[PDB]
Each structure stands twice: as C-alpha cells, then as structure tokens.
Amino acid sequence: SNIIKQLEQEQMKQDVPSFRPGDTVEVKVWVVEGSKKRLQAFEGVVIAIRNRGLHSAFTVRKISNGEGVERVFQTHSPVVDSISVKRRGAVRKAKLYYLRERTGKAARIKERLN
RNA sequence: GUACACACCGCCCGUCACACCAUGGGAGUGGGUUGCAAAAGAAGUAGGUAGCUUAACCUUCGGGAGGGCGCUUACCACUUUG
Ligand SMILES: [K+]
Ligand SMILES: [K+]
Ligand SMILES: [K+]
Ligand SMILES: [K+]
Ligand SMILES: [Mg+2]
Ligand SMILES: [Mg+2]
Ligand SMILES: [Mg+2]
Ligand SMILES: [Mg+2]
Numbered sequence: 001s002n003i004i005k006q007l008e009q010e011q012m013k014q015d016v017p018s019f020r021p022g023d024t025v026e027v028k029v030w031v032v033e034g035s036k037k038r039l040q041a042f043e044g045v046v047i048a049i050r051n052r053g054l055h056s057a058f059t060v061r062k063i064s065n066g067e068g069v070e071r072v073f074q075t076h077s078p079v080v081d082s083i084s085v086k087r088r089g090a091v092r093k094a095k096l097y098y099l100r101e102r103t104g105k106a107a108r109i110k111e112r113l114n
Numbered sequence: 115g116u117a118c119a120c121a122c123c124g125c126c127c128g129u130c131a132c133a134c135c136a137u138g139g140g141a142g143u144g145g146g147u148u149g150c151a152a153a154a155g156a157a158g159u160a161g162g163u164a165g166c167u168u169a170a171c172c173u174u175c176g177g178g179a180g181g182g183c184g185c186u187u188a189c190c191a192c193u194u195u196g
Contacts, residue, residue, distance in 0.1 A: 105154090111165080111185075113166095
C-alpha cells in the first residue's frame with residue numbers, strides 16, 4: 001500500500017481546518033466564466049464528513065433563494081480554494097440527515113461553547 | 115244577452131311547424147370573496163438568560179452595579195394545507 005500512499009500523500013492539502021458536523025462553514029470555490037477566474041462562496045451547515053485521506057469529502061447544506069441545496073465537496077480538490085468555520089454547532093450525530101426534513105425554527109442548531 | 119263596431123262573411127283559443135330573444139334545470143367545470151381547523155414565524159416590542167463585551171456610577175483597585183451583543187420564549191405579517 002506504500003506506492004499508493006506516496007502517490008496520495010504528495011497531493012494532500014496541508015492547511016485544512018478542523019470542522020465538525022453541525023458547524024457552519026464558508027467554502028470558497030473557483031468559478032470559470034470564459035477567461036476570468038473568481039471565487040464564489042457557499043456557506044451552510046456541515047451535515048456529513050467522509051474521512052478517507054486524499055478521498056475525504058464533506059457535505060454542506062443551505063437554503064438558497066427559497067430552495068434547499070447540498071454540495072458534496074472533495075476536500076483536497078484544487079477547485080476548493082478555502083474553508084472557514086463561521087459558527088460551531090452542537091449535535092450528537094455524525095450525520096445530520098434529519099435536517100433534510102426540517103426548516104426554519106425546527107432546523108436550528110445550538111452553538112457549541114468551548 | 116253580448117268579449118261584436120268595415121259590426122257573425124264579427125270575434126277568438128291551444129298544440130304543432132318556422133324565426134328571434136331573455137330565463138329555470140343540468141354530468142359538472144373554472145374564477146372572486148369568505149367561515150372554520152391547523153401549519154408557518156421576517157422585522158418589531160416585551161419577558162428570560164447559558165456565552166461574549168463594556169466611556170460616565172461605586173470600589174477594599176481585584177472588581178461590583180448597570181448597559182450592550184448574542185441566544186431563547188410570547189404575540190404577529192407573508193405564505194401553506196384541508
Ligand atoms: K249594447
Ligand atoms: K296555431
Ligand atoms: K335554455
Ligand atoms: K438581551
Ligand atoms: Mg263564424
Ligand atoms: Mg343555466
Ligand atoms: Mg403558531
Ligand atoms: Mg422572530
């Protein structure tokens with residue numbers, strides 16, 4: 001497994017911040033429109049994390065312009081320019097799929113004080 | 115006696131056929147308004163308060179009081195369902 005380990009290690013990002021399910025994060029991703037390249041933000045609740053080395057991913061949910069949207073980011077992709085935690089959430093579960101059935105007041109997540 | 119008056123060779127009724135018009139019913143179906151039973155909860159105001167932060171007052175100079183932010187509850191507009 002050392003050959004593939006070396007291949008994966010040379011590609012991993014070194015500056016991924018720590019975040020947990022239930023946190024609010026802002027993800028800045030590259031967008032190409034013609035010749036221009038710019039950063040677009042996507043901010044929402046982390047509802048799932050897949051810890052898998054170079055194949056790590058995380059899922060962010062938001063309500064956007066009257067519509068719920070989920071994005072599954074590949075953590076080490078160069079498309080993802082940056083990740084930052086905006087608010088720390090207090091949940092028990094690793095996977096918050098129950099939030100898909102909730103809106104407004106029913107979907108609130110308590111802040112994690114630490 | 116009369117409903118006749120170009121005066122019984124008068125007057126006149128209804129179905130049927132034709133034309134037009136408005137209207138009742140009608141499998142139902144589309145709008146408007148509205149009742150009831152719920153869902154919902156922006157902003158504001160009021161109550162509470164883990165957490166964060168404080169120009170005037172009081173300090174035994176460490177702080178205290180009080181305030182603010184944030185969070186939370188109540189009321190409620192949009193909106194949704196039957
Ligand atoms: K007479
Ligand atoms: K006739
Ligand atoms: K008719
Ligand atoms: K307050
Ligand atoms: Mg005759
Ligand atoms: Mg009719
Ligand atoms: Mg209510
Ligand atoms: Mg409110």
